[PDB]
Write a protein that binds this ligand. Sequence first.
Ligand SMILES: OC[C@@H](Cc1c[nH]c2ccccc12)Nc1ncnc2[nH]ccc12
Length: 167
Amino acid sequence: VNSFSGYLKLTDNVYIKNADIVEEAKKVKPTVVVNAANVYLKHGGGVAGALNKATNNAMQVESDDYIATNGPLKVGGSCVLSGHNLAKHCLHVVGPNVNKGEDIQLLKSAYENFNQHEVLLAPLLSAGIFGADPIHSLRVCVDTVRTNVYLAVFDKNLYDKLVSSFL
Ligand SMILES: OC[C@@H](Cc1c[nH]c2ccccc12)Nc1ncnc2[nH]ccc12
Protein backbone atom coordinates (compact mmCIF):
# COMPACT_ATOMS: atom_id res chain seq x y z
CA VAL A 1 0.00 0.00 0.00
CA ASN A 2 1.20 3.50 -0.91
CA SER A 3 -0.22 7.02 -0.66
CA PHE A 4 -0.93 7.63 -4.37
CA SER A 5 -4.62 8.52 -4.72
CA GLY A 6 -7.10 8.76 -7.58
CA TYR A 7 -5.15 6.88 -10.26
CA LEU A 8 -6.62 4.69 -12.98
CA LYS A 9 -4.97 1.26 -13.12
CA LEU A 10 -3.80 0.45 -16.64
CA THR A 11 -1.84 -2.77 -15.99
CA ASP A 12 -0.41 -4.77 -13.10
CA ASN A 13 2.16 -2.01 -12.48
CA VAL A 14 1.18 1.18 -14.38
CA TYR A 15 -1.24 3.81 -13.06
CA ILE A 16 -2.28 7.10 -14.66
CA LYS A 17 -3.91 10.36 -13.54
CA ASN A 18 -4.64 13.86 -14.85
CA ALA A 19 -2.43 15.85 -12.51
CA ASP A 20 0.28 18.48 -12.24
CA ILE A 21 3.40 16.49 -11.31
CA VAL A 22 4.65 19.39 -9.18
CA GLU A 23 1.50 19.44 -7.06
CA GLU A 24 1.43 15.64 -6.92
CA ALA A 25 5.01 15.42 -5.68
CA LYS A 26 4.39 18.10 -3.05
CA LYS A 27 1.41 16.10 -1.76
CA VAL A 28 2.85 12.58 -1.88
CA LYS A 29 6.56 13.29 -1.28
CA PRO A 30 7.40 10.08 -3.18
CA THR A 31 10.68 8.27 -2.87
CA VAL A 32 11.39 9.04 -6.54
CA VAL A 33 10.05 11.74 -8.85
CA VAL A 34 11.15 11.48 -12.48
CA ASN A 35 12.25 14.61 -14.32
CA ALA A 36 11.94 14.91 -18.09
CA ALA A 37 15.54 16.08 -18.40
CA ASN A 38 17.89 16.99 -21.23
CA VAL A 39 21.52 15.88 -21.42
CA TYR A 40 22.76 19.21 -19.99
CA LEU A 41 20.31 19.16 -17.07
CA LYS A 42 19.18 22.64 -18.15
CA HIS A 43 15.72 22.76 -16.59
CA GLY A 44 14.13 25.48 -18.66
CA GLY A 45 10.60 24.43 -19.54
CA GLY A 46 8.07 21.66 -19.58
CA VAL A 47 8.17 19.34 -16.60
CA ALA A 48 11.83 20.17 -15.90
CA GLY A 49 11.26 23.92 -15.71
CA ALA A 50 8.24 23.38 -13.46
CA LEU A 51 10.01 21.01 -11.06
CA ASN A 52 13.04 23.27 -10.85
CA LYS A 53 10.88 26.34 -10.18
CA ALA A 54 9.18 24.48 -7.33
CA THR A 55 12.63 23.87 -5.76
CA ASN A 56 13.42 27.61 -5.90
CA ASN A 57 16.22 26.80 -8.43
CA ALA A 58 18.02 24.41 -6.04
CA MET A 59 17.56 21.61 -8.59
CA GLN A 60 19.39 23.70 -11.20
CA VAL A 61 22.24 24.60 -8.81
CA GLU A 62 22.75 20.93 -7.93
CA SER A 63 22.50 19.95 -11.60
CA ASP A 64 25.13 22.48 -12.69
CA ASP A 65 27.59 20.99 -10.21
CA TYR A 66 26.73 17.49 -11.46
CA ILE A 67 27.46 18.47 -15.08
CA ALA A 68 30.66 20.31 -14.17
CA THR A 69 31.94 17.11 -12.54
CA ASN A 70 30.54 14.42 -14.84
CA GLY A 71 29.71 15.97 -18.20
CA PRO A 72 26.42 15.54 -20.04
CA LEU A 73 24.13 12.56 -19.81
CA LYS A 74 23.40 10.30 -22.77
CA VAL A 75 20.08 10.44 -24.58
CA GLY A 76 18.30 7.45 -23.06
CA GLY A 77 20.32 7.80 -19.85
CA SER A 78 19.67 9.07 -16.35
CA CYS A 79 21.16 10.16 -13.06
CA VAL A 80 19.85 10.19 -9.50
CA LEU A 81 20.01 13.53 -7.69
CA SER A 82 18.21 15.07 -4.74
CA GLY A 83 14.44 15.42 -4.76
CA HIS A 84 14.79 18.65 -2.73
CA ASN A 85 11.40 19.63 -1.24
CA LEU A 86 9.46 17.45 -3.71
CA ALA A 87 10.67 13.87 -3.16
CA LYS A 88 13.52 11.95 -1.58
CA HIS A 89 15.25 11.56 -4.96
CA CYS A 90 14.84 12.93 -8.46
CA LEU A 91 15.61 10.52 -11.30
CA HIS A 92 16.58 12.78 -14.21
CA VAL A 93 15.79 10.76 -17.36
CA VAL A 94 16.61 11.92 -20.90
CA GLY A 95 14.08 10.81 -23.47
CA PRO A 96 14.73 11.64 -27.12
CA ASN A 97 13.63 15.16 -28.15
CA VAL A 98 12.06 14.71 -31.59
CA ASN A 99 12.34 18.47 -32.14
CA LYS A 100 16.13 17.89 -32.09
CA GLY A 101 16.04 14.95 -34.53
CA GLU A 102 16.82 12.35 -31.85
CA ASP A 103 16.02 8.68 -32.41
CA ILE A 104 12.60 7.74 -31.01
CA GLN A 105 13.93 4.19 -30.57
CA LEU A 106 15.86 5.59 -27.58
CA LEU A 107 12.56 6.02 -25.73
CA LYS A 108 12.62 2.38 -24.62
CA SER A 109 16.15 2.80 -23.26
CA ALA A 110 14.97 5.90 -21.38
CA TYR A 111 12.11 4.01 -19.72
CA GLU A 112 14.45 1.14 -18.74
CA ASN A 113 15.96 3.50 -16.15
CA PHE A 114 12.68 3.30 -14.22
CA ASN A 115 13.28 -0.41 -13.52
CA GLN A 116 16.05 0.50 -11.07
CA HIS A 117 13.41 1.92 -8.67
CA GLU A 118 10.57 0.00 -7.06
CA VAL A 119 8.05 2.90 -7.17
CA LEU A 120 8.13 6.18 -9.12
CA LEU A 121 6.04 9.26 -9.87
CA ALA A 122 6.70 10.18 -13.47
CA PRO A 123 5.66 12.06 -16.62
CA LEU A 124 5.35 10.50 -20.05
CA LEU A 125 8.87 10.61 -21.46
CA SER A 126 9.44 12.52 -24.71
CA ALA A 127 5.87 13.92 -24.58
CA GLY A 128 4.94 17.59 -24.41
CA ILE A 129 7.70 19.88 -25.67
CA PHE A 130 9.92 16.88 -26.46
CA GLY A 131 7.67 16.37 -29.47
CA ALA A 132 6.77 12.66 -29.41
CA ASP A 133 3.27 11.18 -29.57
CA PRO A 134 2.12 10.67 -25.94
CA ILE A 135 0.06 7.62 -26.98
CA HIS A 136 3.27 5.98 -28.17
CA SER A 137 5.12 7.04 -25.03
CA LEU A 138 2.46 5.42 -22.84
CA ARG A 139 2.68 2.20 -24.88
CA VAL A 140 6.47 2.07 -24.51
CA CYS A 141 6.12 2.76 -20.79
CA VAL A 142 3.68 -0.11 -20.27
CA ASP A 143 5.79 -2.48 -22.38
CA THR A 144 9.13 -1.54 -20.73
CA VAL A 145 8.63 -0.57 -17.08
CA ARG A 146 8.13 -3.49 -14.71
CA THR A 147 8.30 -1.54 -11.44
CA ASN A 148 5.35 0.45 -10.09
CA VAL A 149 4.92 3.70 -12.00
CA TYR A 150 2.40 6.46 -11.30
CA LEU A 151 2.05 8.61 -14.43
CA ALA A 152 0.93 12.23 -14.09
CA VAL A 153 -0.51 13.71 -17.30
CA PHE A 154 -0.78 17.50 -17.04
CA ASP A 155 -3.19 18.10 -19.93
CA LYS A 156 -6.71 16.97 -19.03
CA ASN A 157 -7.70 16.71 -22.68
CA LEU A 158 -4.65 14.53 -23.33
CA TYR A 159 -5.36 12.39 -20.26
CA ASP A 160 -8.86 11.57 -21.51
CA LYS A 161 -7.46 10.64 -24.93
CA LEU A 162 -4.76 8.38 -23.43
CA VAL A 163 -7.28 6.49 -21.30
CA SER A 164 -9.88 6.16 -24.05
CA SER A 165 -7.31 4.91 -26.59
CA PHE A 166 -5.43 2.56 -24.26
CA LEU A 167 -5.22 -1.03 -25.46
O1 LIG B 1 2.44 18.17 -21.59
C1 LIG B 1 2.91 16.83 -21.69
C2 LIG B 1 3.53 16.41 -20.27
C3 LIG B 1 4.96 15.63 -20.44
C4 LIG B 1 6.19 16.46 -20.75
C5 LIG B 1 7.55 16.03 -20.71
N1 LIG B 1 8.41 17.10 -21.07
C6 LIG B 1 7.69 18.20 -21.34
C7 LIG B 1 8.30 19.44 -21.73
C8 LIG B 1 7.39 20.49 -21.98
C9 LIG B 1 6.07 20.24 -21.83
C10 LIG B 1 5.53 19.04 -21.45
C11 LIG B 1 6.32 17.93 -21.18
N2 LIG B 1 3.60 17.63 -19.38
C12 LIG B 1 3.47 17.63 -17.96
N3 LIG B 1 2.97 16.49 -17.38
C13 LIG B 1 2.82 16.43 -16.01
N4 LIG B 1 3.10 17.39 -15.11
C14 LIG B 1 3.60 18.53 -15.71
N5 LIG B 1 3.97 19.66 -15.02
C15 LIG B 1 4.43 20.63 -15.89
C16 LIG B 1 4.35 20.11 -17.19
C17 LIG B 1 3.82 18.75 -17.12
